[PDB]
Amino acid sequence: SIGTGDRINTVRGPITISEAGFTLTHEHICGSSAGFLRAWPEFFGSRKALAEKAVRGLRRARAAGVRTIVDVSTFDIGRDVSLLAEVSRAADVHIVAATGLWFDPPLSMRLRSVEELTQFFLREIQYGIEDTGIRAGIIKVATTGKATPFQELVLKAAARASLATGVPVTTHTAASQRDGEQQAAIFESEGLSPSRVCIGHSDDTDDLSYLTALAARGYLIGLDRIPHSAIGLEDNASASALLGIRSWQTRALLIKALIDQGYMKQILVSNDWLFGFSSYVTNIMDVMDRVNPDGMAFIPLRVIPFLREKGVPQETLAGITVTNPARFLSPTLRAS
Amino acid sequence: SIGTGDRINTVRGPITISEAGFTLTHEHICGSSAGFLRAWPEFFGSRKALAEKAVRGLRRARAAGVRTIVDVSTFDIGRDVSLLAEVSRAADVHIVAATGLWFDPPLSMRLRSVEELTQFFLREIQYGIEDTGIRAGIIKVATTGKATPFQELVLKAAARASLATGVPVTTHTAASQRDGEQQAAIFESEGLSPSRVCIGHSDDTDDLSYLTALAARGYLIGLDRIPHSAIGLEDNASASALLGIRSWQTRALLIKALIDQGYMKQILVSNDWLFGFSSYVTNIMDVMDRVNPDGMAFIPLRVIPFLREKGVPQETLAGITVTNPARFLSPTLRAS
Numbered sequence: 209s210i211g212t213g214d215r216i217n218t219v220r221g222p223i224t225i226s227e228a229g230f231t232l233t234h235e236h237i238c239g240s241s242a243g244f245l246r247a248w249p250e251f252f253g254s255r256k257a258l259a260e261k262a263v264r265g266l267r268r269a270r271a272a273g274v275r276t277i278v279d280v281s282t283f284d285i286g287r288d289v290s291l292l293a294e295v296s297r298a299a300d301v302h303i304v305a306a307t308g309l310w311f312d313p314p315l316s317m318r319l320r321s322v323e324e325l326t327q328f329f330l331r332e333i334q335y336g337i338e339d340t341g342i343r344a345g346i347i348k349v350a351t352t353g354k355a356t357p358f359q360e361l362v363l364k365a366a367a368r369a370s371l372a373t374g375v376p377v378t379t380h381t382a383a384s385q386r387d388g389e390q391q392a393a394i395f396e397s398e399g400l401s402p403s404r405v406c407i408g409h410s411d412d413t414d415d416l417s418y419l420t421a422l423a424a425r426g427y428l429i430g431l432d433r434i435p436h437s438a439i440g441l442e443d444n445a446s447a448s449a450l451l452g453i454r455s456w457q458t459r460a461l462l463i464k465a466l467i468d469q470g471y472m473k474q475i476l477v478s479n480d481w482l483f484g485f486s487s488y489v490t491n492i493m494d495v496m497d498r499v500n501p502d503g504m505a506f507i508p509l510r511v512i513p514f515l516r517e518k519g520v521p522q523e524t525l526a527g528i529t530v531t532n533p534a535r536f537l538s539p540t541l542r543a544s
Numbered sequence: 545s546i547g548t549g550d551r552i553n554t555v556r557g558p559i560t561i562s563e564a565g566f567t568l569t570h571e572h573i574c575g576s577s578a579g580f581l582r583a584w585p586e587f588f589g590s591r592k593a594l595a596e597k598a599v600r601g602l603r604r605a606r607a608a609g610v611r612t613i614v615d616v617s618t619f620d621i622g623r624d625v626s627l628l629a630e631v632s633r634a635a636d637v638h639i640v641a642a643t644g645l646w647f648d649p650p651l652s653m654r655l656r657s658v659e660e661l662t663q664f665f666l667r668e669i670q671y672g673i674e675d676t677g678i679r680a681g682i683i684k685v686a687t688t689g690k691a692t693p694f695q696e697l698v699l700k701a702a703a704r705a706s707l708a709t710g711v712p713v714t715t716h717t718a719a720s721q722r723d724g725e726q727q728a729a730i731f732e733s734e735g736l737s738p739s740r741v742c743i744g745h746s747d748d749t750d751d752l753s754y755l756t757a758l759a760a761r762g763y764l765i766g767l768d769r770i771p772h773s774a775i776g777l778e779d780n781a782s783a784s785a786l787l788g789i790r791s792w793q794t795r796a797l798l799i800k801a802l803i804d805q806g807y808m809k810q811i812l813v814s815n816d817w818l819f820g821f822s823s824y825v826t827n828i829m830d831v832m833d834r835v836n837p838d839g840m841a842f843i844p845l846r847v848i849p850f851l852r853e854k855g856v857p858q859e860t861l862a863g864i865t866v867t868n869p870a871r872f873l874s875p876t877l878r879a880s
């Protein structure tokens with residue numbers, strides 16, 4: 209395989225692979241909908257309040273050593289690259305933007321062909337997002353159980369954009385339903401290397417069979433929702449449905465399990481946090497903030513030490529939080 | 545009833561009622577999706593190409609006497625008020641912007657309560673769209689058959705915003721399924737006066753009984769799709785499903801029919817045209833432009849003269865295209 213220039217696109221421009229440092233690979237500054245943050249900022253108090261909250265959070269995460277986060281917010285998660293650039297500069301944390309489509313594509317996207325979609329993903333990666341010149345450094349896709357016809361098109365366009373640019377693909381999955389397998393099937397049918405793909409939300413399930421089967425094939429396993437837990441909130445139906453009833457320690461243990469299985473090179477870890485969240489019930493943000501006051505700092509502050517205690521070597525945790533993300537994000541073309 | 549200032553909000557600011565003049569009440573500069581025009585302008589060639597096309601089309605309609613158009617593009621139809629302002633100034637045609645929600649609300653909108661929706665509509669009307677200070681002069685809603693639970697919330701929020709601001713409500717209906725009746729019932733249950741409402745796409749039906757009974761209750765009847773016809777495109781399934789097989793003459797005669805039943809004051813006429821269209825199959829804009837090369841000028845150039853030869857008095861046509869839209873758009877509050 210070959211590289212395209214050894215640089216990773218961030219919202220402040222290209223950085224070298226070494227500059228990425230400690231990287232959280234699945235995060236969000238704001239989980240919203242296309243055009244929403246700009247049409248109704250007051251839903252988050254104000255765009256300023258949101259920016260200010262995000263800067264505090266990024267600064268707290270940075271104090272714990274996070275130097276880079278991958279904001280996997282696609283067009284339909286309401287990604288506002290201008291907001292990302294502003295908070296990245298104010299907090300001095302590298303932010304890698306995404307292209308791709310999540311599970312709320314509007315009609316103008318749902319009626320598109322795979323060829324059309326491939327050109328939109330390529331546009332965001334090569335030309336840049338909107339008119340900002342900010343190029344996407346990752347392609348985000350998703351399935352909530354068996355892929356629907358439109359989602360298959362998205363996965364295929366994702367694989368094509370990745371094969372042409374070298375930018376990796378990262379996925380949302382209904383991990384319990386083993387979505388990662390079908391996703392991998394499609395990706396491979398397009399000729400994409402598994403090393404270019406992270407099967408996300410993999411800690412949303414406890415089947416090590418599933419996870420180790422994927423890692424053996426060469427995929428990156430995204431254990432990205434470690435702090436998500438509604439334990440103690442059984443009285444809240446909406447928060448329970450979203451966060452699940454498994455402990456953060458249960459999720460964290462899958463990281464050690466994969467390490468013991470021998471797949472430390474294939475693990476990517478994250479919080480899947482955000483500072484604003486309009487695509488769910490009102491006030492979900494407050495509920496989650498009570499659940500995990502540490503926000504994106506959760507991984508370094510709670511998870512890394514938990515694993516070290518459970519016996520995982522510090523050398524290994526560095527490999528996971530620094531080396532793996534560096535290899536994943538470096539634009540890499542398949543050998544011609 | 546009461547006025548709130550006797551001025552109509554346009555994208556270039558307020559205009560007196562007599563400045564509105566000849567007004568097309570249901571049109572679009574671009575029928576898209578939230579954030580789409582800004583994220584993928586190349587889908588329309590370029591933002592600049594799209595804008596030049598709209599200016600040309602607006603100038604042609606202006607040449608025929610059109611002084612104002614109501615762009616009923618909602619947040620989810622991808623309304624880009626900056627684009628409206630730019631072409632309004634360049635073509636020197638007043639454009640009234642809309643708030644409300646059509647049938648592609650994203651998750652951040654679909655999960656909102658009637659109270660929350662009401663605040664968003666009031667925001668766009670009072671404070672302005674996004675951060676532009678451009679205030680909505682009309683509220684757009686829609687159903688396509690029986691109202692879904694979300695759509696009932698949208699209708700009620702629209703009635704509450706209209707009651708508070710005086711701005712009228714205009715609707716998209718599956719006219720042949722008589723949606724007008726359920727919309728009316730919901731609007732009247734909120735205390736909205738029928739005179740603040742236009743039941744749109746009414747010319748999509750041939751059921752004069754249904755139309756007259758609504759007119760009788762004081763509703764305005766939008767015969768806004770006059771040039772929509774796929775006659776001669778019987779081999780084009782997508783175009784046929786969108787435009788129908790009824791001729792423009794058949795649609796237009798509904799204007800005469802309503803006049804004959806004695807409801808000239810209740811009629812509003814339009815083309816429901818656009819210059820960019822991404823929320824449907826690719827290249828649909830090209831098929832429509834071939835169908836109706838006159839575009840928005842179709843009403844003044846073909847329809848007004850046709851009615852004239854069918855015996856409708858010139859003065860009655862002036863009342864419909866000038867007086868009725870003026871009365872409709874004047875923000876009007878219910879009596880204290």
Ligand SMILES: CCOP(=O)(Cc1ccc(C)cc1)OCC
Nearest residue numbers: 229230272273508512526529530
């Ligand atoms: C390899 C030495 O770690 P590092 O380079 C990056 C790093 C910091 C904190 C944690 C929890 C993991 C990784 O130290 C910061 C300057």
Ligand SMILES: CCOP(=O)(Cc1ccc(C)cc1)OCC
Nearest residue numbers: 565566608609844848862865866
């Ligand atoms: C008395 C009304 O005419 P009007 O004010 C507006 C008007 C112009 C053209 C058509 C087809 C209808 C109405 O004439 C333009 C200066």
Ligand SMILES: [Co+2]
Nearest residue numbers: 350380381409
């Ligand atoms: Co997800």
Ligand SMILES: [Co+2]
Nearest residue numbers: 234236280480
């Ligand atoms: Co996420």
Ligand SMILES: [Co+2]
Nearest residue numbers: 715716717745
């Ligand atoms: Co419509």
Ligand SMILES: [Co+2]
Nearest residue numbers: 570572616816
């Ligand atoms: Co329309």
Ligand code: NA
Nearest residue numbers: 217333334343
């Ligand atoms: Na690039």
Ligand code: NA
Nearest residue numbers: 553669670679
């Ligand atoms: Na107003």
